[PDB]
Amino acid sequence: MFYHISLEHEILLHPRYFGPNLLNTVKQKLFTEVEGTCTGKYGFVIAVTTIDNIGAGVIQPGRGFVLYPVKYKAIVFRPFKGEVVDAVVTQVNKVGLFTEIGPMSCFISRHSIPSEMEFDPNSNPPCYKTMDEDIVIQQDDEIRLKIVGTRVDKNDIFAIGSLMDDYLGLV
Amino acid sequence: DQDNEIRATDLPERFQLRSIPVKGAEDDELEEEADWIYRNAFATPTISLTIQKIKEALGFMRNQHFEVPFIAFYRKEYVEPELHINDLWRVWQWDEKWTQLRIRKENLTRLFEKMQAYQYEQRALDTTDMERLKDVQSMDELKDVYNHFLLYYGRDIPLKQASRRDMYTICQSAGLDGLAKKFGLTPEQFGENLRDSYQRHETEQFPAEPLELAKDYVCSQFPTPEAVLEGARYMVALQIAREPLVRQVLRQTFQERAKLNITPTKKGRKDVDEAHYAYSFKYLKNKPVKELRDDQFLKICLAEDEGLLTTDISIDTYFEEIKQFYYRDEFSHQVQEWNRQRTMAIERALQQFLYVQMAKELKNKLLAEAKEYVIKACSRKLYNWLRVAPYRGIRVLGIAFSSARDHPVFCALVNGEGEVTDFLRLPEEREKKAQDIETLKKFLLNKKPHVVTVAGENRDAQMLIEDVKRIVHEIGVELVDNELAILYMNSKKSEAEFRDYPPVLRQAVSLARRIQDPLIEFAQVCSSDEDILCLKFHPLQEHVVKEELLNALYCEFINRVNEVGVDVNRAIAHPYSQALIQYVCGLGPRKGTHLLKILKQNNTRLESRTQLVTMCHMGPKVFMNCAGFLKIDEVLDGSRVHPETYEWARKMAVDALPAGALEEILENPERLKDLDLDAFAEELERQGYGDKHITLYDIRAELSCRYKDLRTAYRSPNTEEIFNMLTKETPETFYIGKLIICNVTGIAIGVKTRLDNGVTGFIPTKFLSDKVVKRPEERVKVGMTVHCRIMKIDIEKFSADLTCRTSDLM
Amino acid sequence: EEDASQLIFPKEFETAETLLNSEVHMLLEHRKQQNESAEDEQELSEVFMKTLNYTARFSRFKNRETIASVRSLLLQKKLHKFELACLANLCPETAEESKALIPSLEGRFEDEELQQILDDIQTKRSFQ
RNA sequence: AUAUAUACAAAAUCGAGAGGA
C-alpha cells in the first residue's frame, strides 16, 4: 500500500555551505539522502513531499560540521500480509510467476498458482494456462493476488503472493 | 534419466531436445503446413533487409526423421534447387511454429465448443467457430479471436471470476447492449466496411434521438442520460476494437502506412552527440517503417530502453477515412446526432484501443525483425570463420605475445596431428633482440615447421612477422587472427590441457591449432553457450535472444561439420577432436559421447561404418541420419557416399570398366564421363526408385576424391583484414571525422601522434604550416595528448590525417 | 505480526495517511513536472519509475476532483483508511468480491448498503 | 626506428637499583 508519513533525520552540514543559501542546502541534502532508498520499517520510500522543521544547528565541538535535525513528510509503499493488490507479471517460469506490485517484486510459487493452471513453456509467449485456455496468465497481464508473505533483503522488500481465494488472478 | 532414453531411443538427438516433440504428419496436415511455412517464412518483412519443396522436406523431417543436414546432403533432388541448407533449417524452425499454432488452435476449438454447449443449455457462435478458428493463419489473429471471445463469453466460466478492468462488464450489467445494438451496424459489419473501404452495409437509423433511448437505460451506475451514452459509446468501442475483422484491416494499415517519430528525453538531448549510436535518429519525424534498415530499430528500441529517447508509431488521417463509413447522409438533425455519436465511438476505438495495440504489435514485429538480422549477421560471421580450409598434416609453429613491454613471446610447434610438440620462450636491446632472433632460427632450423603464424594483437605483429620473414628466407609465415585464442587461454580447459604452461603459450597452441583446421578449433573452444557467446559476432549480439542466437550459431557449426565430416578414429586417438562429433547430424552431445564411449570401452577403431550399428547399438534411423558423415580413412567408408548407396556406387565402378575396379578408379578416373546420368537415372526408376540423378552426379564426384574438402582454401588476410584485426576496430568504427584522443610523439616535418588504437596520426603539414619554417611547437607542445578529428586514412600503412582547427572540431 | 486481512498494523501506520493509486499517480507526475523542469537536478530513480508506471497502469480515476470525491465519499461513512484505500484501488464489483478482497469488511456493513457504496464508487469512476 | 623495478612498520614484560628537578 501507499501511504504518507512523517519521519526524522539529522544532516551534517560541512562549513562550506554555511553562508547564504544554506537552508536550501539542508533541503537538498535531505532530498539526496532520504529519497530513493527502501527500509523495512517503512517500505519503499517513494519521495519526500514537504519538510516540516529545520532544527537548531548545533556546531559539533571539534570537527566543524553543524548537525541540523529535520522533520519531514514522505510517501511510502508498504505491503502487509494478507493484502490483495494488483500486480503485473513480468516473466513466467515453471516455478511460478514473477510479478511486481509497483516498485516491489512479488512471486507466486507454482504451488500458490491454482491447480487448474499448468505452466506451458512451449507457448509462443510462455504462459500458465488451463487445458482449454479459458484463463491464461502470461507476460504483461495484470492480476490480483494476496500478499501472503514479505521478506527483507538488503533493505529491499519482496512479497510472496497467492492466487488461492476467490476473485484473484487474471484481470 | 532423460539422457538415458535419449541416448537409447532411435531418433536423432536433436529431435528429442526440441520443446514441441516431433510427431508424424498426415499429408493433409503436411500440405497445410507447407503452405503456411511458405507464406510466412517467404513473405516480405516490414523493414528493408516450391511449396512442394517445403512439403517434401517436412515430410522428411517429421515422418522419416531426417535431420536437416541429411535432407540437405542426401536428398538434394527433393529439395534443390529451391531449398538450401539454411532454408531447411528455417523450415524446421517454422515447423515448431506451426505446431504451436495448431495446438493453440485446437485448444481454442475446444473452448469454443464448450461454450457452445453451455449456450445451448441456456449472442452465439455459428460460423465464427468455423470461420474464425479454422481460419487463423497466425498467432496474432488467434489472439484476436481469443480476445474477441473473451469479451463476450468470457464472463462465464461454467473460484470466482476475478472481475475485469475494462468496465465493459459494468456496462453490460445495465443492458447497455441495448444501446450498442441500437447504434447502427453491428461490428462485424463495420469491419467489413473497412475491409472493402466502402460502405458495403448501410447503417440503421432509428425513430428517436440518442437521448431518448438513453432515458430507457439510464438507471443507477449511469444516471444523467448522457452518462449512459458514454457507456454506450464505450461498449461500442470495445466491440469494434475487438472484432477480428477490424483488427485485420487495421493491422494491415499499420503495416503499410506506419510512421515513426522520435524525440530525445531530457537524458538524451545531452548525452547523444555524434558518437553515441543514436546520433542519426535522435530526432526522427515521419520516418516510415518501411524504411527502417537492417538492425536500426533494434538500436532505436535499445536507446529507448536506456530512456534517452522516446518514440511512437502512428499513421500520421486514417480516422477521417474511416468515419465515412459508419455514417449516414440525410441531414435530419436526428441523425446528425446519431452520426456524431457514431463518429466519436470510432474515435475512442481507434484512439485508445486499436492504435495503441497495433503500435505495440508493430513494434514487436519490427524489433524482432531487427533482432533476426543481427542473428543473421552473427551467423554469417561465424560461417565465414568456419568456411576456411586448412593450410597447405602440417607442422605449424605459433607465436603469441602481449603488450610486450617487459613480457615475452612464446611460440609453440604444433604437430600435424595437432598435438603440441615443443615450445620456446623468446624474451642494449639490439643485442637482446639479436640473440632471440638467433635462437629462433636455431629452433626453425632444428624443427622445420611448415607455417609460422603470428598472432594479431597490435602493430607488433607486423614487426614480428617481418623478423620471422627475415629469418625464414635464409616455408611460409602468416599473420593470424587472435580472438579465439584469447578465449582459449582464458578458458578453464586450457588450464586443463596444459597445467604447466603460461597463458600466452596457451594462445600459441591455439593459434597453431586454428590455422591447422579452424573448424576443429572453434568447436573445441566454443564448447558451451557462454563460451561461444564470448566471441564478438556482432556489436549488438548481447541483445538478441540467447536461445535464438545460440541456435543459429550451432546450426552453422552443424552445417560445416557435416560437409567436412568427422573422422571418428582421429577423434579417438587424439582426444582433442572429440568435440566435433556433437555436430554430426544424427548425433548429439549425449549420443556423441556415447559413441565415443563404446568405442573407447571396446578399445577398437571404427574399421567401418556398418561397424557402427554392428559394434555399437545405434538404431536404424540414426545410422541413416549420421552414417553419411563419418569418414573412416571397406574403402567406400571414407567417402561421402552413404551406406545406402554403396551398391549404386559399386555398380558405377563396374560401369567404368571389383576391388581392382574400385582401386583403379581411385588410382585414377579412367573415364569420368563413362557414365550416362540419364541412363543411371532411368534405371533408377526401376532400381532405386527416384530421380536420383544428382545423387549419382555426386557419387561420381566422390569417386574422384574420397571426401574432397569443400572449405575454401586459405588466404592470407587482405590488408583490410590486417587493419581491422591488429587495430581491432571496424570500417565503421573509423568514422572519418571521428573525434579521437591521440598522443603526440614527435615531428619526424609533421606532428607524429600515436593513437590509443595503435595507429599513427599524422597531422598534415597544411594545418602544420611549417615544412622549412620553424617547428610547430608554438601550436602545441610535444609530449602531451590532444583530441582531434580524422580527415583521411592510410590503412595500408596505419596512418590517419587529423585536425587542429576547432573549425574542423565543430 | 502485521496482518491486513485481520486488520493488524504496527504502530507507525496508525496516524499514517493512506492514498489511492490515482492520488499517488497525480502526485508522481507532479513530481515529474518538478523533475523535467528545474535542470541541474538528479533524475528520478528507477524505483520512482516503477511506481510511476504501476500506479499509472492502475489509476482508476484520471481526474483530480473525481479522486477527491471518491475519497470524501469514503470518508463520510465509518471506514478505516485501509479499507478506504483498498476499496478505491481495487474497485470491486459486487459486495462479495469486496469481502473476498477486503476481509476486514467482515460484518461491518450490510451487503446491500455496501453494494450501493460500491456503486457510488463505480459511478464516479472516470472514463479514460 | 627504440626506453627495466614498488615490499611494509620493526623494538617485550616484571622487578630492582641508581640518579635528575
Swiss-Prot record, chain B:
Ubiquitously expressed. Residues 34-810 are annotated as: Interaction with KDM6A. It is found in: Nucleus. Disulfide bonds: none annotated. The modification N6-acetyllysine is found at K376. Residues 749-805 form the S1 motif domain. It comes from the Eukaryota. Belongs to the SPT6 family. Interacts with RNA polymerase II and the DRB sensitivity-inducing factor complex (DSIF complex), which is composed of SUPT5H and SUPT4H1. Interacts with KDM6A. Interacts (via SH2 domain) with SETD1A. Interacts (via SH2 domain) with POLR2A phosphorylated at 'Ser-2'. Interacts with IWS1, AICDA and PAAF1. Interacts with histone H2B and H3. Interacts with WDR43. (Microbial infection) Interacts with human cytomegalovirus/HHV-5 protein UL69. Histone H3-H4 chaperone that plays a key role in the regulation of transcription elongation and mRNA processing. Enhances the transcription elongation by RNA polymerase II (RNAPII) and is also required for the efficient activation of transcriptional elongation by the HIV-1 nuclear transcriptional activator, Tat. Besides chaperoning histones in transcription, acts to transport and splice mRNA by forming a complex with IWS1 and the C-terminal domain (CTD) of the RNAPII subunit RPB1 (POLR2A). This is Transcription elongation factor SPT6. It comes from Homo sapiens (Human). The lineage of its organism: Eukaryota, Metazoa, Chordata, Craniata, Vertebrata. The gene is SUPT6H.
